[PDB]
Amino acid sequence: SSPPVVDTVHGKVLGKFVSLEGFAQPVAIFLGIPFAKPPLGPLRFTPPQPAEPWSFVKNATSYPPMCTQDPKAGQLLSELFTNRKENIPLKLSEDCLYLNIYTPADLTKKNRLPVMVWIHGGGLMVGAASTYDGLALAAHENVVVVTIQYRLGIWGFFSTGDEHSRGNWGHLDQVAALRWVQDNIASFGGNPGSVTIFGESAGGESVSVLVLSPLAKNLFHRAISESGVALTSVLVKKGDVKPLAEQIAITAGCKTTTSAVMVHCLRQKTEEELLETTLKMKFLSLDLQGDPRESQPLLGTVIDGMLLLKTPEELQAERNFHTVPYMVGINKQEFGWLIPMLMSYPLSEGQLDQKTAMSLLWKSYPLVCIAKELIPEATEKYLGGTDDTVKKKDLFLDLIADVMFGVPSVIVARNHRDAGAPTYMYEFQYRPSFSSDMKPKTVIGDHGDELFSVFGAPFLKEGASEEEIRLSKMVMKFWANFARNGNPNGEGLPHWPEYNQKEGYLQIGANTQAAQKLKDKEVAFWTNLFAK
Amino acid sequence: SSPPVVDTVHGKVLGKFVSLEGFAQPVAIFLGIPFAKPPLGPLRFTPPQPAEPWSFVKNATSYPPMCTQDPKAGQLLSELFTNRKENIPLKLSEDCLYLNIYTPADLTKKNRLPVMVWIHGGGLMVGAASTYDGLALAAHENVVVVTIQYRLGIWGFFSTGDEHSRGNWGHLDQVAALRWVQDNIASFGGNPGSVTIFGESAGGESVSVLVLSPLAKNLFHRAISESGVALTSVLVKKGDVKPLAEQIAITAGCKTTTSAVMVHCLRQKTEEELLETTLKMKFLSLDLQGDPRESQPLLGTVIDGMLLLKTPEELQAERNFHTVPYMVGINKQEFGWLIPMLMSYPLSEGQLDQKTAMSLLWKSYPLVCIAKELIPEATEKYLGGTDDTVKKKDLFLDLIADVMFGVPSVIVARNHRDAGAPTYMYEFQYRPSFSSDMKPKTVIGDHGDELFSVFGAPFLKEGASEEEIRLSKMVMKFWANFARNGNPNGEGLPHWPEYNQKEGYLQIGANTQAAQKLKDKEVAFWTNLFAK
Amino acid sequence: SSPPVVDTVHGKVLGKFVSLEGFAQPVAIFLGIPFAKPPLGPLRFTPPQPAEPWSFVKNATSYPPMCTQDPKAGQLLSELFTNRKENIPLKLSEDCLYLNIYTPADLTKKNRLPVMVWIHGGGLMVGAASTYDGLALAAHENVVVVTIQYRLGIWGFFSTGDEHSRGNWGHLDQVAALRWVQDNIASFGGNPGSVTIFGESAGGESVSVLVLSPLAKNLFHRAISESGVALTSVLVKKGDVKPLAEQIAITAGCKTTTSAVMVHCLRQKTEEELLETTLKMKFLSLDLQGDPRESQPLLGTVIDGMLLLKTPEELQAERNFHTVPYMVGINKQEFGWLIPMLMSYPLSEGQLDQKTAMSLLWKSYPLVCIAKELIPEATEKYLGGTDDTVKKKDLFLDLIADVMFGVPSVIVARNHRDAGAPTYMYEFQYRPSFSSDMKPKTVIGDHGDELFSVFGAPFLKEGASEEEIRLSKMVMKFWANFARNGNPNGEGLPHWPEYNQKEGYLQIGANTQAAQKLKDKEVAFWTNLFAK
Ligand SMILES: C[C@@H](CCC(=O)NCCS(=O)(=O)O)[C@H]1CC[C@H]2[C@@H]3[C@H](O)C[C@H]4C[C@@H](O)CC[C@]4(C)[C@H]3C[C@H](O)[C@]12C
Ligand SMILES: C[C@@H](CCC(=O)NCCS(=O)(=O)O)[C@H]1CC[C@H]2[C@@H]3[C@H](O)C[C@H]4C[C@@H](O)CC[C@]4(C)[C@H]3C[C@H](O)[C@]12C
Ligand SMILES: C[C@@H](CCC(=O)NCCS(=O)(=O)O)[C@H]1CC[C@H]2[C@@H]3[C@H](O)C[C@H]4C[C@@H](O)CC[C@]4(C)[C@H]3C[C@H](O)[C@]12C
Ligand SMILES: C[C@@H](CCC(=O)NCCS(=O)(=O)O)[C@H]1CC[C@H]2[C@@H]3[C@H](O)C[C@H]4C[C@@H](O)CC[C@]4(C)[C@H]3C[C@H](O)[C@]12C
Ligand SMILES: C[C@@H](CCC(=O)NCCS(=O)(=O)O)[C@H]1CC[C@H]2[C@@H]3[C@H](O)C[C@H]4C[C@@H](O)CC[C@]4(C)[C@H]3C[C@H](O)[C@]12C
Ligand SMILES: C[C@@H](CCC(=O)NCCS(=O)(=O)O)[C@H]1CC[C@H]2[C@@H]3[C@H](O)C[C@H]4C[C@@H](O)CC[C@]4(C)[C@H]3C[C@H](O)[C@]12C
Ligand SMILES: CC(=O)N[C@H]1[C@H]([C@H](O)[C@H](O)CO)O[C@@](O)(C(=O)O)C[C@@H]1O
Ligand SMILES: CC(=O)N[C@H]1[C@H]([C@H](O)[C@H](O)CO)O[C@@](O)(C(=O)O)C[C@@H]1O
Ligand SMILES: CC(=O)N[C@H]1[C@H]([C@H](O)[C@H](O)CO)O[C@@](O)(C(=O)O)C[C@@H]1O
Ligand SMILES: *[C@@H]1O[C@H](CO)[C@@H](O)[C@H](O)[C@H]1NC(C)=O
Ligand SMILES: *[C@@H]1O[C@H](CO)[C@@H](O)[C@H](O)[C@H]1NC(C)=O
Ligand SMILES: *[C@H]1O[C@H](CO)[C@@H](O)[C@H](O)[C@H]1NC(C)=O
Predict the structure, then answer these.
(1) Contact between A430 and A471 (Cβ < 8 Å)
(2) Sheet holding C11-14, edge to edge
(3) Structural domain tally of chain B?
(4) Which of C8, C14, C54, C62 best tests ligand 9's pocket when mutated (most atoms within 8 Å of CB)?
(5) Which of A302, B144, B192, C39 is most open to solvent, judged by the fewest CB atoms within 10 Å of its CB?
(6) Where is the active site (chains A, B, C)?
């Protein structure tokens, strides 16, 4: 009856009860709980700070703003990924360090349900936590779902390569939220002792990162990466970054006399100004002309010396870290449609040839980082198969899909396994009915397609075949089960082999059954082609 | 001789000696002593901070600037209230956290005279400490007089209802000055152990507030409210204030995305800008058209959760607080001329009728907060008396005068009495010869009229009848005596009955004699009319 | 070889090895090591703060920017003083609190060589540490040479005469660097226990200042002032400075309502803006028209109450301070050419007369501070000698040279001697072959001429007569020796008498031999002429 009121370390929070069809216990929902101090003014480009405690009762009943980002791009992605029926239009602001909590527990008791913290993707450029509705998953598997937000673009990843602005602000925000959960989740019926992180795309990469970070140690107990890991090069800036810093500085109208000078000048700029700079830059939009190597696609994770002490590669080559059950998965066709369409890929011809391929792959250097001396050899192994110009276009996509997620994922999984830690893999092959109209019916297992099963899209949206509804129920169980025991298995669900020496993984889809050696041939191949 | 030099915790202060006619020991006067760090830049809308200590000798010989406020309004009020012969023109600035000290002690000794700290009024919108000259009172009753300043308008009362800008900056400034006095007054011959706060209008309201605030506890030992208390609704913002915040924000040219966003944006604005916004808001002028309820008159005290933990009403219903001798007084005709004239009241006809009255009272909602369903009944009890349209105009004034000060004051006094604490009341009925020309000779005991007797106007200005001179001498004695023993009585002065169960109070004026049950009929009445 | 990497309290520093002709052990050189946090934003006009520690290895391999200053003036002086063959063009920035280290030690050992910290001159208006190359001196006398930088002009000396902006930021920066050396120099083979400060012109004045400052106590163990001391009036602002503050404020487009208001407003201004203001002020160029007394030449050292508790004069009249070996020297013709040419002195006629002299001396009031009632008498003692209009021009120069450096220096030296501390004086008379072309061959011992011998110019530049090369070798020995034992003497070098009661000093030049009572006649004279 009376709105739910929970007590947190910083003050009381007022939520709202929401009931899902066919469920007695209604879910308590809190929207916009702050987990850090608004990173405004001098706090820009600095680690997130603890939030100021409030004097009375804070109403967590309005969706928090999304971090500053390209408004069009953001709203668009929010629509294509949202698991709720009506997409919620959001506001933009630097004041976005909020998290949304969804608890199916009976607050009037001492419940200690498992917690699943979701890290939205968006290439570390755009995205939001309000996009994902935890209602379904919260109710169906009886787990507390938390959707966190973190600084994006410049605001969360600007780096000068030195102590004046190390960088990785966004990841720090992520860590911060995790501590908030440790220190508060208990009041929402969650068990701080069983926290599970999971995300997709950049969000999945972030999970991979936190699993390597000394800082994260002890903030979670199970991890899941969906279509995205740390070895996913494009998102990790290796090498001297100072140049990009100076570039951003200039475009923003700042001098570059010294690092300190740049950061200071940027701290002066208004959000609006920095947003225009973010636009001027043309990022995700894949540049075709000019020099492919000079084309800088973004500014993500970096080896700051705090969150990460060294490249992911070097890091995983060691087993001197707290290892936890890690689930690493990918989708049948990562580069099926969503991604290419969003970057404005020239493949709007529905066909390609060996010559136009090498050219395209080369201009794709910022997304695949392949030397132009290997391109021919790589193009050969994938396209030299058939003569059907259409098959080549599809093979070309698989090419990129393997370099960006395919191989990285498996490599990560193997290392984790070898480090002596529970590892699990999967390949989601299914075409959700919620797919966009502009998406061809032949694209199955496209980027983010799993999102709908994981977040129970069939129980919030409309017209889900019984098949889809069942698929979703199955995935949530696996996920939730993992979050519970660090093992997806359970009664009623197909057997999911652990990723050990036999390299078994689960193929999720219409026919969900186990398999082995995922992308084994590919990994083996690319590894050599990269050894030059 | 040699200018007076006193040592304070933050450094040496140089003053000036001023002799009053017929007094051997000249008074040492220090003007512009800082008691907090200039609330500039990022310090705006934040609690006042300790002042930076100075290296040599600071000359306290120039009147400090008055906090930013409507310059016309301010200078005008300064003239109508000033107790000195020539009104001193002041400067405006955000740097106004200063206090003026007036000590009749012989600094070359260890004097420990009682202290009286004066809080000027001005509706929390305008005012200044330099307006009041302590010379007379200081010399005549041998007490150290201190005139403090505190942030006004937006600068001192802007609030978003949450931790991003709780509010009550002004009251915090007031508390701050009080601590300064505890930590330093000893060096000017004052006794930190016997500090008495007193003020009028908003300043009187502030005294009432500090008497309820946990923060004030132990900073004073006697209190006096002249024509103004905490129950004086107009000055206390109860309810969700967020709306006014957003309104101010907009007028100032700021977004309203979140609270944090508003405060930050306002911190950017220049003083000039915020002053224009203050003007645009048309703060004091009473709006007649539009919806009377929508008309927002100001932005004063709020229930921040720091200075005040709950509404004054709720607070005084409890006796779990440090109680001190409290003197609560009012004047015969609070709404006689001063106030109406300053708000531009439509009563420039010298007469009114039952119908035009209810209309006027309704538009006066922001100043009386009376439901339009009671207005008729209220108008009846006061105006239904005679038919003389002129008498009604005068009765209408008394109506407001009772709701704004009359009843509140008495109720406050009663609660204080019942809380088991020395309580004293008075009703000042006299027409000072210093009254403005535009003030009719039939208005006696108008708002602020007591100010002239209290600050010894007859000994600084010119042409005071012996009667006025004597009246003043009498009031100062009562006041000073209270400041000394928490009891006005003393030899040579009429007997002042304590406000106990018989409800005795003192009628000050040409014929000063005791009386009983002040505004008893009214209180009783209004209480019911308000119980709907 | 592997670049030199040293560990400091704030992190690892990477340098570069540089070998000098005919020296086995190459010198390790580190350029741009930060010793304080960039004084940007709110840190402007505030004491320097500790630097932020870095996570990996900081490459100290690029010349740090020079503090904001008149670019033309700066580059010009850098050329005329530089001891290296090719003048290094620098960048301007508020981020300039860096120091350059030059160590001839074998970092692979526990070396503890003496340290010599150089404070460049430039009237506290311009200058840089990168101008002086320590390579030679470092190698030749086996001492660790450090060249520090400190805030200049407005940025480092703006003062309001009160706690809102005491001033002497620049000197504080200097002190700060010295603490850095105490806390870190050990890692570069230096001995924190044997630090020697030395500078020229304003830099020399600064040395004189640190020797009187309580703050400096224990940061050095030997001091050297070249052509510049604390009594050098022009550089020390005595009296109420508030006026200059308000002037600067106005020119910068700020109000002057209060001190706090001025400082705040100035903190807002951009570097560019303040640089334009610095230019508008026409600071170093000597004004001829208008009132000579009103002409304000600069804004240097002030009696802040922190760095300096009272005027140098009063201070040295006391012997209650830590006294160390102090070397005070001057050059034959301080006002020979460099200075006059740089202020745009009207003496471009190559001759003058008794009448035009008094007029010039008077307009020179901001540089000599002589009353117009003494000018005639002063002009007489120096010019009344011969009739040769040319001799007068030369005598006129000596006149100023004695008031600005000559007498002050000796007076300082005497006091130091009398305070019971090792004192040494010298008079450098030589014309370096590196002199500018526009410098007449008859000018010997011009301002800054010693700089070339001290920094080993003959070993870095080209075409040095064997005579010059030997002179330089000799000076470096004396200097280094002093830095070692607080006594210049040693085998192979002429005997340098200590400045005791006989007042012996060393005449350095082609024929280096001792002498006595330097400028004795002059001091005696001027002292009386000044006693009015
Ligand atoms: C954020 C998404 C697209 C947003 C877009 O805005 N639509 C297009 C143009 S818009 O002007 O306004 O119309 C996604 C879609 C595909 C994603 C990219 C690819 O999938 C490649 C990945 C590889 C990852 O591991 C790292 C991120 C990344 C290098 C990507 C960055 C980012 O998350 C992208 C680009
Ligand atoms: C972005 C859209 C273009 C809208 C535009 O107006 N053009 C329409 C027709 S044409 O192009 O100009 O010929 C879509 C509409 C249909 C899409 C194409 C077809 O649906 C065929 C697919 C096959 C996919 O698996 C790969 C992309 C793709 C090879 C396409 C590239 C692209 O996303 C297109 C061209
Ligand atoms: C400061 C004075 C006037 C301010 C004014 O702006 N002048 C008028 C027009 S101006 O364009 O430029 O000329 C005083 C005079 C009468 C005062 C008001 C009334 O007396 C009513 C009181 C009731 C109090 O308890 C609280 C303050 C208050 C609600 C007032 C706020 C304030 O102190 C006022 C308005
Ligand atoms: C603000 C002033 C108006 C100046 C204006 O130019 N009008 C002048 C004459 S008229 O109005 O237009 O009829 C003053 C001057 C005289 C004042 C009036 C009279 O003095 C009568 C008083 C009686 C008071 O106790 C109440 C206000 C009041 C009923 C008045 C309202 C108001 O303050 C007036 C009208
Ligand atoms: C830095 C030099 C000149 C600066 C100058 O600005 N150049 C000139 C004109 S500009 O664009 O070409 O316009 C030197 C040359 C002579 C120096 C001055 C004189 O030698 C007098 C000395 C006395 C010292 O003990 C203190 C510094 C000082 C009071 C000087 C300050 C400064 O170092 C000066 C002025
Ligand atoms: C600043 C220079 C002027 C360049 C200008 O174009 N004038 C050239 C010839 S004239 O002036 O116009 O007569 C130099 C060039 C030669 C210099 C002059 C001569 O060399 C004579 C010297 C003697 C010095 O010891 C004192 C300065 C000085 C008495 C000079 C003042 C000044 O620095 C001058 C005049
Ligand atoms: C500021 C605003 O208008 N939005 C609502 C906020 C939001 O939670 C946060 O702004 C983002 O979620 O929550 C409140 O209840 C609160 O914090 O007291 C106030 C308001 O109702
Ligand atoms: C106008 C003004 O008030 N500022 C004055 C301040 C005051 O000390 C404080 O403001 C408090 O009076 O400092 C002076 O008096 C002073 O030390 O010479 C001069 C200055 O004009
Ligand atoms: C952009 C630039 O060239 N500056 C250099 C700075 C300097 O340390 C400071 O500017 C002081 O010289 O930082 C480095 O040296 C470093 O720490 O690795 C790299 C860089 O080359
Ligand atoms: C206070 O002392 C300062 C410092 O000299 C001086 O400027 C000021 O005029 C003095 N105050 C007055 C006005 O007497
Ligand atoms: C640091 O300096 C070394 C040697 O000059 C160089 O190899 C390296 O690239 C530099 N690193 C940085 C931070 O640029
Ligand atoms: C927040 O929303 C709740 C509804 O649950 C409401 O009662 C409350 O008043 C709101 N906050 C305020 C005080 O405005």
Answers:
(1) yes
(2) C5-8, C11-14, C57-59
(3) 1
(4) C62
(5) B192
(6) 201 (acyl-ester intermediate), 334 (charge relay system), 447 (charge relay system)
Q: Which amino acid is at C215?
A: L
- Whole-number Å distance, alpha carbon C164 to ligand 10 midpoint, is 16
Test site for ligand 7: of B159, B160, B162, B164, most ligand atoms within 8 A of the Cβ: B162
Long-range pairs of A515-520 with CB within 8 A, sequence gap ≥ 24: A515/A427, A518/A410, A518/A425, A518/A427, A519/A402, A519/A406, A519/A407, A519/A409, A519/A410, A520/A410
Question: Rg of chain C over CA atoms, in angstroms?
Answer: 22
- How far apart CA C377 and CA C530 sit, in angstroms, is 11
Residues 6+ apart with CB under 8 A from B16: B3, B4, B28, B29, B30, B61
∠ Cα C196 C198 C199 (to 5°): 165
Q: How was this structure determined?
A: X-ray
- Do A95 and B163 make contact, defined as CB atoms within 8 angstroms? no
Q: To the nearest whole angstrom, how far is the Cα of C173 from the nearest Cα of chain A? A: 18
Asked whether C350 lines ligand 6 (CB < 6 A), one says yes
Between chains, do B55 and C164 touch, taking CB under 8 Å as contact?
A: no
For C437, the token pair is: 């072309």
Q: Are the C-beta atoms of C130 and C31 separated by less than 8 Å? A: yes
Whole-number Å distance between alpha carbons of A207 and A214: 13
| Residue among C42, C163, C260 minimizing CB distance to B55 | C163
Q: Tell me how far apart the alpha carbons of residues A380 and B419 are, in angstroms, rounded to a whole number.
A: 93
CA distance B28 to B6: 10
How far off is chain C from B52, nearest CA to CA, in Å? 7
- Look up the CATH number of the domain holding residue C301: 3.40.50.1820
Report CA(A16)–ligand 8 centroid distance (Å).
57
Furthest-apart CA pair in chain B: how many Å? 71
Cα–Cα distance for residue pair B131/A482, rounded to 1 Å: 73
Instruction: Enumerate long-range contacts of A166-169, CB under 8 Å, 24 or more apart.
Output: A166/A302, A166/A304, A166/A305, A166/A306, A166/C55, A167/A241, A167/A302, A167/A304, A168/A301, A168/A302, A168/A304, A168/A306, A168/A307, A168/A308, A169/A39, A169/A45, A169/A46, A169/A47, A169/A48
| Tally of CB atoms within 10 A around A436 | 11
Beta bridge mates, C425: C328
Distance B58 CA to ligand 8 centre (A): 8
DSSP for residue A51: P
Cα of A381 to nearest chain C Cα, Å = 42
Domain assignment of residue C312, given as a range: 1-532
